[PDB]
Amino acid sequence: FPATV
Amino acid sequence: FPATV
Amino acid sequence: GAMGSMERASLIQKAKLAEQAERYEDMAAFMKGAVEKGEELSCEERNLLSVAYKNVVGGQRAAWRVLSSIEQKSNEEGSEEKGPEVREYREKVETELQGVCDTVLGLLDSHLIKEAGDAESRVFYLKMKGDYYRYLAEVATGDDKKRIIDSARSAYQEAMDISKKEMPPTNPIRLGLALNFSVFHYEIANSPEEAISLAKTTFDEAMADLHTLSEDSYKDSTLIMQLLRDNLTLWT
Amino acid sequence: GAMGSMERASLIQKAKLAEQAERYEDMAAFMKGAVEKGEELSCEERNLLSVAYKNVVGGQRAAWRVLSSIEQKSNEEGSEEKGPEVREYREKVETELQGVCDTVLGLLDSHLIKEAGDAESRVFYLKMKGDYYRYLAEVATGDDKKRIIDSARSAYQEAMDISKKEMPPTNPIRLGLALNFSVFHYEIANSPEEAISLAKTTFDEAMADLHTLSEDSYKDSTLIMQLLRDNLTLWT
Ligand SMILES: *CC(=O)Nc1ccc(-c2nc3ccccn3c2Nc2c(C)cccc2Cl)cc1
Ligand SMILES: *CC(=O)Nc1ccc(-c2nc3ccccn3c2Nc2c(C)cccc2Cl)cc1
Ligand SMILES: [Ca+2]
Ligand SMILES: [Ca+2]
Ligand SMILES: [Ca+2]
Ligand SMILES: [Ca+2]
Ligand SMILES: [Ca+2]
Ligand SMILES: [Ca+2]
Ligand SMILES: [Cl-]
Ligand SMILES: [Cl-]
């Protein structure tokens, strides 16, 4: 999964 | 802490 | 609600203890109680709110993905019928996840967003609104899926417009908004080109502004810039 | 209870899904429902029960320790008064922990132990009874603390007596019982010499019986024997 904050 | 199972 | 009898300051103190103890459901309940006192949230308090719910929903999303994968395998050719249990339990987790999202969206609508006038608060809350509609979109499969997606899009777009007018390109909130909106494009809106464009433009405009920053601000901004780069690397 | 309308087999299936999804509270609730069907548990099902509750209470114990440490620091000389919140929240976590322990002890008393006649089942459940009284003892500070400790001791001792008569010295249940009873001696009963003696005798008697085992049984037994060794190393 891609990075999120 | 010591090991328990 | 349940936290109606506890002092605001005590709710905040206990949210911080809950974080130290990795008790994120408790942390979220404390922060919900604090929001329901009706006063605006400081920067620190907004971050407590977001950390709590991010950790709760993050766990639910990870569990949902496990269960969905099992369910998908059960529906392949050659798979032995196992009955309704996998679907039921995925549905259970899904419903709880939707409930948490609805709770957060409810706090934002009643009444955090409408009282948020400063860019740092307003963008923060609109980013949250986009995020929690994005989580709802991840599990949406019915008649409202398009509307859920559009609700995420609209919240992110309003946040983006404010952030571009009111914040420098290295502002961590602005950066993290762009990171997440980029992921929305890639994973939800079927718009990988938009995702890549946004991540690259965000990175490059931030790099050009780093020279204005202190050592500590530079550290904060470059951390998020590396996440943008990591996604770009995943996607290209 | 809440799981009264779900089939036993469906509860077991969902406990296994919950484990895969790392949803241990759900897993425990499923297994509680399965126990309350009133039928005895197979070996696999007993292990599902124990895994679920071990993970739930393990998290609560870790949180309790964090909060207790903060509370102890608050009560040192020079520490600024912070109000009742640390104590309150430690008490909250403690009460929930006690509730989980009481739930497990309740399942064992109503009616898992009394129907367990085979050594592998009976020792397993008595070990659990010792473990959950040990967890209660970890947080006990009042008039009943001695009685709680003695309840743990008595359960472990009955399990020990059966295991020595009915199981080989390499049996994993026997080994894990001895490991935990040894830790009871060290951490709860203020009996480090007894703890060390038990761990060493258990290790040495198991080593002497490994020659009787298959490759797979050998792997199982040696894993737990290494835990005994690890504790001995910590303690000497
Ligand atoms: C007042 C305010 O919200 N300030 C602020 C600034 C930065 C962050 C933040 N810093 C880092 C570093 C590494 C990873 C993530 N983050 C975040 N998270 C975050 C959040 C919660 C919202 C928007 C953007 C970002 Cl980067 C938090 C708060
Ligand atoms: C029917 C039955 O209970 N059988 C059984 C045998 C071994 C274990 C077991 N194996 C391992 C390996 C590494 C670490 C822990 N364990 C356990 N756990 C355990 C439990 C849950 C109870 C008593 C002793 C042990 Cl070792 C489980 C079940
Ligand atoms: Ca008040
Ligand atoms: Ca659904
Ligand atoms: Ca305002
Ligand atoms: Ca039935
Ligand atoms: Ca108490
Ligand atoms: Ca029986
Ligand atoms: Cl279910
Ligand atoms: Cl509390």
In this complex, which chains have at least 3 CB pairs below 8 Å with chain A? C
**Do D89 and C20 count as a contact with CB atoms less than 8 A apart?**
no
Q: Helices D8-20 and D43-74 sit at what angle, rounded to 10 degrees? A: 50
- Cβ-based contacts of A5 with chain C (< 8 Å): 176, 179-180, 224, 227
Q: Distance between CA D170 and CA D217 in Å, rounded?
A: 9
Would you tell me which residues 20-39 of chain D have a C-beta closer than 8 angstroms to some C-beta of chain B?
none
Contacts of C138 (CB under 8 A, 6+ apart): C61, C64, C187, C188
Q: Which of C46, C124, C179 to mutate to test the interface with A (most CBs of A within 10 A)?
A: C179
The DSSP H or E segment spanning D174 is helix D172-183
Quick one: which of D189, D190, D181 has its CA closest to D231? Answer: D181
User: How buried is D216 (Cβ within 10 angstroms: 0-12 exposed, 13-18 middle, 19+ buried)?
Assistant: exposed
Domain that holds residue C190: 8-235
- Per-residue HEC secondary structure of D91-124 comes to HHHHHHHHHHHHHHHHHHHHHHHHHCCCHHHHHH
The reply to whether C63 touches chain D by the CB within 8 Å rule is yes
In a domain, C1, yes or no: no
Compute the CA torsion angle C38, C33, C163, C169 (nearest 10 deg).
130
Calpha distance D27→D43 (Å, rounded): 16
Taking a C-beta distance cutoff of 8 angstroms, is the pair D11, D34 a contact? yes
Query: Residue C50 corresponds to which tokens in the numbers above?
Result: 């977001």
**Residue D2 maps to a domain:** no
Rounded Cα distance between D196 and B2, Å, is: 12
Structure tokens at D208: 């002497």
D187 touches chain B (CB under 8 A): yes
- Does residue D3 form part of some domain? no
Structural domain includes residue C138:
yes
User: Which residue, among D79, D159, D84, D6, has the nearest Cα to C9 in the 3D structure?
Assistant: D84
* Nearest residue to D106 (alpha-carbon basis) of D114, D95, D3: D114
Residues 6+ apart with CB under 8 A from C96: C60
Residue D59: name the closest of C171, C21, C28 by CA. Answer: C21
- Residues 6+ positions from C103 with CB-CB distance below 8 Å: C32, C53
Cα separation, D162 vs D177, in Å, equals 11
| Gap between the Cα atoms of D53 and C234, Å rounded | 39
Give domain status of residue C65, yes or no.
yes
The approach used to solve this structure was X-ray
Chains in contact with B, where contact means 3 or more Cβ–Cβ distances below 8 Å, are D
CATH assignment at residue D221: 1.20.190.20
**What is the distance of C-alpha D62 from the center of its chain?**
14
CB distance C126 to C155 below 8 Å: yes
Whether residue C179 contacts residue C224, with contact meaning beta carbons closer than 8 Å, is answered with yes
In SS3 terms, chain C reads as CCCCCCCHHHHHHHHHHHHHCCCHHHHHHHHHHHHHCCCCCCHHHHHHHHHHHHHHHHHHHHHHHHHHHHHHHHCCCCCCCCCCHHHHHHHHHHHHHHHHHHHHHHHHHHHHHHHCCCHHHHHHHHHHHHHHHHHHHHHCCCCCHHHHHHHHHHHHHHHHHHHHHHCCCCCHHHHHHHHHHHHHHHHHCCCHHHHHHHHHHHHHHHHCCHHHCCHHHHHHHHHHHHHHHHHHHHHC
Which atom belonging to ligand 1 lies closest to the Cα atom of C128?
Answer: 22
Exposure string for C48-87, b = 16+ CB within 10 A, e = fewer: bbbbbbbbbbebbbebbbbbbebbeeeeeeeeeeeeebbe
Q: For residue C49, which of C128, C122, C110 has the smallest C-alpha distance?
A: C128
Are C163 and C170 in contact, with CB atoms under 8 Å apart? Answer: no
- Provide the token pair at C33: 């109680």
Of the candidates C150, C102, B4, C76, the residue with the CA atom closest to the CA atom of residue D195: B4
Q: Which two tokens stand for residue C70?
A: 């099992």
Residue whose structure tokens are 């039928």: D39
The ligand that comes nearest to the alpha carbon of residue D118 is 8
Report DSSP state, residue D40.
P
Backbone dihedral angles phi then psi of residue D214, each to the nearest 5 degrees: -65, 165
Candidate of D19, D47, D124, D226 to mutate for ligand 2, largest count of ligand atoms within 8 Å of Cβ: D47
Cis before C111? omega within 30? yes
Q: Which of D97, D159, D99, D100 is nearest to D129 (CA)?
A: D159
How many domains are contained in chain C? 1
**Are the C-beta atoms of D64 and D93 separated by less than 8 Å?**
yes
Which residues are CB-neighbours of D21 under 8 A, at least 6 positions away?
C62, C63, C66, C67, C93
Pull the structure tokens for residue D97.
């922990």
D191 exposure class (CB count in 10 Å sphere: 0-12, 13-18, 19+): middle
Taking the CA atoms of residue C8, residue C12, residue C14 and residue C16 in that order, the dihedral angle to the nearest 10 degrees is: 180
| Data resolution in angstroms | 1.5
Rg (chain A; Cα; Å): 5
Burial label, D49 (beta-carbon count in 10 A; 0-12, 13-18, 19+): buried
Given a contact cutoff of 8 angstroms between Cβ atoms, the answer to whether C67 and D14 are in contact is no
Chain D residues within 8 A of C63 when measuring between CB atoms: 21-23
Burial class (CB in 10 A: 0-12, 13-18, 19+), D38: exposed
Place of tokens 């609805």: C102
**Contact criterion met (CB below 8 Å) for C204 and C168:** no
Judged by DSSP in three states, D42 sits in: coil
In a domain, D127, yes or no: yes
To the nearest 10 degrees (0 to 180), the angle between helices D192-207 and D215-235 is 150
Which residues of chain A make contact with C171, given a CB cutoff of 8 A? none
Helix axes D8-20, C43-74, angle to 10 degrees: 120
Please note each residue after which chain D is broken, C-to-N distance over 2.5 A, or write none. Answer: none
Show the tokens assigned to C12. 């905040």
Residue D15 · residue D37 · CB < 8 Å? no
Token code pair at residue D18: 């919950």
DSSP state of D80: P
Structure-block tokens of residue D61: 């114990």
Cβ pair D93, C23 in contact under 8 A? yes
* Structural domain includes residue C3: no
Q: Which of C134, C166, C162, C160 is nearest to C149 (CA)?
A: C134
Burial of residue D143 (number of CB atoms within 10 Å: 0-12, 13-18, 19+): exposed
